């Protein structure tokens, strides 16, 4: 039971972060932070400076 819950659990958190980055890219920060790869449910990566 633990393996299935942990996964789903570790996937909803990742989505939360990608959404936030996209939202920030609009309003305040803007074209200074970029996403380079988001395969869903596994990982993401951000670029800066």
């Amino acid at each position: 039971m633990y393996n299935c819950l942990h996964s789903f659990c570790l996937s909803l958190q990742l989505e939360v972060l990608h959404s936030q980055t996209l939202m920030l890219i609009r309003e305040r920060w803007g074209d200074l932070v970029q996403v380079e790869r988001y395969h869903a449910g596994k990982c993401l990566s951000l670029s800066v400076w």
């Binding site: 299935c4 996964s7 789903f8 996937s11 909803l12 989505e15 959404s19 869903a40 449910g41």
Partner: peptide, 25 residues
């Protein structure tokens, strides 16, 4: 005598869950 329009994502995770964890009955 309501939906906050985020089911366009959580649904996908569930599908990824079901596609990866088939019921055992």
């Amino acid at each position: 005598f309501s939906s906050i329009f985020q089911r366009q994502r959580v649904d996908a995770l569930l599908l990824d869950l079901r596609q990866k964890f088939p019921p055992k009955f």
